[PDB]
Ligand binder design. Structure first.
Ligand SMILES: *C(=O)c1ccc(-c2ccc(-c3ccc(C(*)=O)cc3)s2)cc1
Ligand SMILES: *C(=O)c1ccc(-c2ccc(-c3ccc(C(*)=O)cc3)s2)cc1
Ligand SMILES: *C(=O)c1ccc(-c2ccc(-c3ccc(C(*)=O)cc3)s2)cc1
Ligand SMILES: *C(=O)c1ccc(-c2ccc(-c3ccc(C(*)=O)cc3)s2)cc1
Ligand SMILES: *C(=O)c1ccc(-c2ccc(-c3ccc(C(*)=O)cc3)s2)cc1
Ligand SMILES: *C(=O)c1ccc(-c2ccc(-c3ccc(C(*)=O)cc3)s2)cc1
Ligand SMILES: *C(=O)c1ccc(-c2ccc(-c3ccc(C(*)=O)cc3)s2)cc1
Ligand SMILES: *C(=O)c1ccc(-c2ccc(-c3ccc(C(*)=O)cc3)s2)cc1
Ligand SMILES: *C(=O)c1ccc(-c2ccc(-c3ccc(C(*)=O)cc3)s2)cc1
Ligand SMILES: *C(=O)c1ccc(-c2ccc(-c3ccc(C(*)=O)cc3)s2)cc1
Ligand SMILES: *C(=O)c1ccc(-c2ccc(-c3ccc(C(*)=O)cc3)s2)cc1
Ligand SMILES: *C(=O)c1ccc(-c2ccc(-c3ccc(C(*)=O)cc3)s2)cc1
Ligand SMILES: *C(=O)c1ccc(-c2ccc(-c3ccc(C(*)=O)cc3)s2)cc1
Ligand SMILES: *C(=O)c1ccc(-c2ccc(-c3ccc(C(*)=O)cc3)s2)cc1
Ligand SMILES: *C(=O)c1ccc(-c2ccc(-c3ccc(C(*)=O)cc3)s2)cc1
Ligand SMILES: *C(=O)c1ccc(-c2ccc(-c3ccc(C(*)=O)cc3)s2)cc1
Ligand SMILES: *C(=O)c1ccc(-c2ccc(-c3ccc(C(*)=O)cc3)s2)cc1
Ligand SMILES: *C(=O)c1ccc(-c2ccc(-c3ccc(C(*)=O)cc3)s2)cc1
Ligand SMILES: *C(=O)c1ccc(-c2ccc(-c3ccc(C(*)=O)cc3)s2)cc1
Ligand SMILES: *C(=O)c1ccc(-c2ccc(-c3ccc(C(*)=O)cc3)s2)cc1
Ligand SMILES: *C(=O)c1ccc(-c2ccc(-c3ccc(C(*)=O)cc3)s2)cc1
Ligand SMILES: *C(=O)c1ccc(-c2ccc(-c3ccc(C(*)=O)cc3)s2)cc1
Ligand SMILES: *C(=O)c1ccc(-c2ccc(-c3ccc(C(*)=O)cc3)s2)cc1
Ligand SMILES: *C(=O)c1ccc(-c2ccc(-c3ccc(C(*)=O)cc3)s2)cc1
Ligand SMILES: *C(=O)c1ccc(-c2ccc(-c3ccc(C(*)=O)cc3)s2)cc1
Ligand SMILES: *C(=O)c1ccc(-c2ccc(-c3ccc(C(*)=O)cc3)s2)cc1
Ligand SMILES: *C(=O)c1ccc(-c2ccc(-c3ccc(C(*)=O)cc3)s2)cc1
Ligand SMILES: *C(=O)c1ccc(-c2ccc(-c3ccc(C(*)=O)cc3)s2)cc1
Ligand SMILES: *C(=O)c1ccc(-c2ccc(-c3ccc(C(*)=O)cc3)s2)cc1
Ligand SMILES: *C(=O)c1ccc(-c2ccc(-c3ccc(C(*)=O)cc3)s2)cc1
Lengths: 5, 5, 5, 5, 5, 5, 5, 5, 5, 5, 5, 5, 5, 5, 5, 5, 5, 5, 5, 5, 5, 5, 5, 5, 5, 5, 5, 5, 5, 5, 5, 5, 5, 5, 5, 5, 5, 5, 5, 5, 5, 5, 5, 5, 5
């Protein structure tokens, strides 16, 4: 996945 | 998935 | 999926 | 799906 | 689906 | 689908 | 899917 | 999927 | 998937 | 996957 | 995977 | 979805 | 959906 | 839907 | 989804 | 258990 | 269990 | 357990 | 497991 | 496990 | 394990 | 345990 | 383990 | 997803 | 344990 | 282990 | 995902 | 233990 | 081990 | 993922 | 232990 | 071991 | 991942 | 121990 | 995965 | 070992 | 994998 | 990963 | 011990 | 994975 | 061993 | 793997 | 993996 | 692997 | 792995 912050 | 914050 | 916040 | 908040 | 809040 | 609470 | 809480 | 809380 | 909190 | 907190 | 905090 | 056993 | 066993 | 066993 | 055993 | 929604 | 909605 | 939503 | 007051 | 007041 | 006030 | 959401 | 006030 | 045992 | 979200 | 105020 | 035992 | 998110 | 105020 | 025992 | 996120 | 204020 | 025993 | 993130 | 910050 | 203010 | 904090 | 015993 | 991240 | 900061 | 202010 | 902090 | 900073 | 701090 | 700074 890809967590973006 | 992709969590966006 | 995609959770948006 | 897509949860929006 | 799509939950909106 | 869609479900709240 | 989509689920809140 | 998508799940919040 | 995607999950917050 | 993707998970925050 | 991906995990924050 | 939302399972509460 | 929403299962409450 | 909403199952309450 | 969201399992609360 | 004892589920109170 | 004992489900109170 | 004892789930209070 | 069972609910009370 | 069971819920109280 | 069980919930109280 | 004792889950309070 | 169980939750209190 | 989000398991709360 | 005693999970408070 | 159990949560308090 | 997010397991809270 | 005693998890407070 | 258990959480306090 | 994110295990909180 | 006593995990406060 | 346990957390305080 | 991220284990917090 | 006593983990505060 | 890929965490971005 | 336990955390304080 | 990928994990922050 | 990141173990915090 | 007493881990503060 | 790949953590970016 | 335990952490203080 | 990959881990920061 | 590869941590970049 | 890869770990910073 | 490879940490880059
Ligand atoms: C060999 O067995 C093998 C198996 C899996 C892989 C993967 C490379 C990237 C993967 C991945 C990317 C992004 C996400 C989230 O969006 C999840 C997994 S798996 C390589 C070699
Ligand atoms: C080899 O067996 C293999 C299997 C799976 C993969 C994946 C690469 C990216 C994946 C992914 C991306 C994004 C999301 C969320 O949106 C979930 C999974 S799986 C690579 C190699
Ligand atoms: C190889 O076996 C394989 C299987 C699945 C995948 C996926 C790439 C992205 C996926 C995904 C994206 C977004 C969402 C939510 O909207 C859910 C799943 S699965 C790659 C390779
Ligand atoms: C390979 O087997 C495979 C299977 C499924 C997928 C998916 C990519 C995105 C998906 C998805 C997106 C959005 C939602 C909610 O709206 C649910 C699922 S599944 C990729 C590869
Ligand atoms: C491959 O097998 C595969 C199967 C399903 C999918 C999906 C992509 C998005 C989906 C979806 C979107 C929105 C909702 C709610 O409105 C429910 C499902 S399923 C991709 C690939
Ligand atoms: C060994 O042969 C083998 C079997 C399974 C896998 C996986 C590839 C991608 C995986 C994955 C990544 C991210 C997520 C996020 O939820 C879920 C699954 S497992 C590799 C090698
Ligand atoms: C094996 O290949 C396999 C079997 C099942 C799955 C699932 C991914 C998400 C699932 C799910 C989503 C939502 C709910 C109600 O929340 C229940 C199950 S099953 C992946 C791979
Ligand atoms: C195997 O390939 C497989 C079997 C089932 C699934 C499911 C994903 C989500 C499911 C679901 C959603 C919502 C509800 C009522 O909430 C019940 C089940 S089943 C994925 C893959
Ligand atoms: C296998 O491919 C498979 C079988 C069933 C499913 C389901 C996804 C959501 C389902 C569902 C939604 C809502 C309700 C009443 O809430 C009951 C079931 S079944 C996915 C994949
Ligand atoms: C084996 O190859 C295999 C079997 C299952 C899986 C799953 C990845 C995510 C799953 C899932 C997502 C969401 C929910 C309700 O949250 C339940 C299960 S199962 C990967 C690989
Ligand atoms: C069909 O196999 C089937 C479905 C459910 C069950 C259950 C065994 C124990 C259950 C339960 C225990 C405790 C509580 C809360 O106090 C709620 C449900 S359901 C057996 C067989
Ligand atoms: C058809 O197989 C079938 C469907 C449900 C069941 C159940 C076994 C135990 C159940 C249950 C236990 C405890 C509580 C709450 O106190 C609620 C349901 S249902 C068996 C067979
Ligand atoms: C079908 O095999 C089946 C499904 C569930 C169960 C359960 C065994 C113990 C359960 C339970 C224990 C404690 C609490 C909270 O106090 C809630 C559920 S469910 C057995 C068999
Ligand atoms: C089906 O095998 C099955 C599913 C769950 C269980 C459980 C054993 C202990 C459980 C439990 C203990 C404590 C708490 C919180 O106080 C919640 C659940 S569930 C047995 C068999
Ligand atoms: C073996 O090859 C194998 C089996 C399972 C897996 C999984 C990677 C991520 C999984 C998962 C993601 C999300 C959720 C609900 O959060 C549950 C499970 S299973 C990888 C490799
Ligand atoms: C099915 O084997 C199964 C699933 C869970 C369990 C559990 C044993 C102890 C559990 C537990 C202990 C303490 C707390 C918090 O106070 C929460 C859960 S679950 C046994 C068997
Ligand atoms: C053996 O080859 C094997 C078995 C499982 C795995 C997994 C890598 C990541 C997994 C996972 C990701 C996310 C979640 C919910 O967060 C649960 C499990 S399993 C790798 C290699
Ligand atoms: C199934 O084997 C199974 C799953 C979990 C367990 C547990 C034993 C002790 C547990 C626990 C102790 C303390 C705390 C926090 O106070 C939380 C969980 S879970 C046994 C068997
Ligand atoms: C043996 O060859 C083997 C077995 C498992 C593994 C894993 C590497 C990362 C794993 C994992 C990642 C993320 C999560 C949820 O965070 C859980 C497990 S398992 C490598 C080699
Ligand atoms: C299944 O074997 C299983 C899983 C976990 C355990 C645990 C033994 C002690 C645990 C624990 C001690 C202290 C704290 C924080 O105060 C948290 C967890 S879990 C036994 C058996
Ligand atoms: C033996 O050959 C062997 C077994 C396991 C491993 C692992 C390397 C990294 C692992 C891992 C990464 C991430 C997480 C969740 O962070 C859990 C485990 S296992 C190497 C060699
Ligand atoms: C399954 O064998 C298992 C897993 C964990 C344990 C633990 C023994 C002591 C633990 C612990 C002590 C102190 C603190 C912080 O105060 C946190 C965890 S876990 C036993 C058995
Ligand atoms: C040989 O067995 C083997 C197995 C897996 C790999 C991987 C190279 C990159 C991987 C990966 C990239 C990105 C992500 C997240 O997006 C997850 C896994 S696995 C090499 C050699
Ligand atoms: C024996 O040949 C052997 C067994 C395990 C290993 C490992 C090298 C790195 C490992 C690891 C990396 C990351 C994490 C979560 O950070 C956990 C374990 S195990 C080498 C040689
Ligand atoms: C399973 O054998 C197992 C895992 C961990 C332990 C522990 C013994 C002492 C522990 C501990 C002491 C002090 C502190 C910080 O104050 C944190 C952890 S863990 C026993 C058995
Ligand atoms: C020989 O057994 C072997 C097995 C694995 C590898 C890998 C080289 C790079 C890997 C990797 C790259 C990036 C990521 C994250 O995105 C995860 C794993 S595994 C070499 C030789
Ligand atoms: C000895 O024969 C043996 C068995 C396993 C391995 C591994 C190669 C790459 C590994 C690894 C690197 C980085 C990460 C990050 O999470 C996880 C696993 S273990 C070498 C030699
Ligand atoms: C011989 O047994 C052996 C096993 C593993 C290796 C590896 C060379 C590079 C590796 C690696 C690169 C990058 C990453 C992160 O992205 C993780 C592992 S493993 C050499 C020889
Ligand atoms: C002896 O025969 C033996 C068994 C395992 C290994 C390993 C080769 C590469 C390893 C490794 C490097 C870096 C990382 C980062 O997380 C994980 C595993 S262990 C050598 C010799
Ligand atoms: C003989 O047993 C043996 C085993 C492992 C190796 C390795 C050479 C380079 C390795 C490595 C490179 C880079 C990374 C991170 O990206 C991790 C491991 S292992 C040589 C000889």
């Amino acid at each position: 996945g890809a967590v973006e912050v």
